[PDB]
Amino acid sequence: GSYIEREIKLRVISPSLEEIEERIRNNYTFINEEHQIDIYYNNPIRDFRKSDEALRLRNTNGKVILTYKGPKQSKETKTREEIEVEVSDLHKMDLILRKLGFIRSFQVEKIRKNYKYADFIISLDSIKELGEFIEIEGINKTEKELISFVDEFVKKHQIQYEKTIKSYLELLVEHAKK
Amino acid sequence: GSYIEREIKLRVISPSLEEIEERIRNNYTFINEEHQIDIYYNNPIRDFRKSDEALRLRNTNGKVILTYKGPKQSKETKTREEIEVEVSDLHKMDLILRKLGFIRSFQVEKIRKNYKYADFIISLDSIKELGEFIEIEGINKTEKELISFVDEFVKKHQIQYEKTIKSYLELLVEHAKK
Ligand SMILES: [Ca+2]
Ligand SMILES: [Ca+2]
Ligand SMILES: [Ca+2]
Numbered sequence: 001g002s003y004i005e006r007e008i009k010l011r012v013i014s015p016s017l018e019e020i021e022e023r024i025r026n027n028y029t030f031i032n033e034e035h036q037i038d039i040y041y042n043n044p045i046r047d048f049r050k051s052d053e054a055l056r057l058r059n060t061n062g063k064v065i066l067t068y069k070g071p072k073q074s075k076e077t078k079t080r081e082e083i084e085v086e087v088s089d090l091h092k093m094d095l096i097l098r099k100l101g102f103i104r105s106f107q108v109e110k111i112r113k114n115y116k117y118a119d120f121i122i123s124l125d126s127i128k129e130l131g132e133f134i135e136i137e138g139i140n141k142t143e144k145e146l147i148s149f150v151d152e153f154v155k156k157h158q159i160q161y162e163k164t165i166k167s168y169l170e171l172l173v174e175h176a177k178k
Numbered sequence: 179g180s181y182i183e184r185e186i187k188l189r190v191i192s193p194s195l196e197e198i199e200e201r202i203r204n205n206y207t208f209i210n211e212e213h214q215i216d217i218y219y220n221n222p223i224r225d226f227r228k229s230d231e232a233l234r235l236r237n238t239n240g241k242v243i244l245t246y247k248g249p250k251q252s253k254e255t256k257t258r259e260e261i262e263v264e265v266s267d268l269h270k271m272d273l274i275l276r277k278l279g280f281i282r283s284f285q286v287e288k289i290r291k292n293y294k295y296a297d298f299i300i301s302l303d304s305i306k307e308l309g310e311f312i313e314i315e316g317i318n319k320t321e322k323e324l325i326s327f328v329d330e331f332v333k334k335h336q337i338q339y340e341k342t343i344k345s346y347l348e349l350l351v352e353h354a355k356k
């Protein structure tokens with residue numbers, strides 16, 4: 001019951017996400033907008049920052065999702081095992097995790113606008129306190145195919161960018177101490 | 179987001195649960211029958227058998243429930259903090275727990291027939307490998323009120339019984355090594 005999430009994450013340098021949305025509006029199909037508030041957790045005895053694991057409880061437009069992510073499997077894209085379940089109650093799931101000994105680590109909040117283009121999901125991310133990013137995830141795609149599509153995507157829409165395989169959680173920590 | 183579960187558990191000596199069901203049929207309202215398969219988990223570093231805690235993943239008529247239970251708060255009834263969430267997928271939740279380091283401990287399986295009588299829930303339990311039990315749980319009830327109702331219940335229906343505050347998990351372990 002596991003799945004490999006493969007995506008590329010771009011920090012947007014120019015233009016604004018609003019202007020990018022205008023550029024893709026006509027050829028990409030809008031899916032939905034998600035307001036996502038994420039709580040991350042650590043295990044006191046198994047520093048997830050050493051094993052490169054993550055446990056997250058997400059509220060996305062009121063839907064509550066518990067996610068495990070495993071260590072990164074690539075240096076060219078952000079590739080990780082991901083296991084997710086929907087749960088009925090966020091407060092109670094958080095209570096269970098804390099009763100089991102997990103400790104709340106950090107919180108990430110964003111507005112995400114999802115677009116679809118031929119088995120690719122393009123997410124325009126406005127991250128509280130971090131700024132503007134784009135993620136592209138592949139549906140039954142090889143790493144090569146994803147990398148090639150992203151190169152075509154940024155070129156077609158004249159986006160200036162920096163790629164990274166750091167998570168938003170990791171980028172948030174870097175940003176705080178600066 | 180916590181709740182105090184208070185119940186009394188009876189091991190039935192006589193008559194059979196089938197005969198007991200006949201005796202209560204006319205004055206107690208049938209709610210439903212549940213086929214419940216439970217997986218229990220332990221934390222390798224926090225022996226739940228020492229802290230008197232439990233983590234359980236239940237499949238009850240196909241509904242999947244993750245439950246935490248805290249230490250017993252009474253010697254006269256089985257009284258414990260309980261926190262529960264419904265989850266979308268049992269295999270994936272079990273995988274998440276195992277990825278986090280939890281280990282599957284034991285499994286309990288039963289058929290449970292639930293009846294209602296004036297804010298009391300009477301559960302007739304046929305436990306695989308353990309035998310026949312009755313649980314009575316109180317809705318906004320004091321311990322005194324629950325104890326008194328159970329005394330009236332066993333007397334009214336001529337049940338021979340033994341009370342216990344051991345869990346089914348604990349009773350299963352005792353039964354195995356005999
Ligand atoms: Ca992502
Ligand atoms: Ca993703
Ligand atoms: Ca019980």
Ligand SMILES: [Ca+2]
Pocket residue numbers: 183185313315
């Ligand atoms: Ca109960």
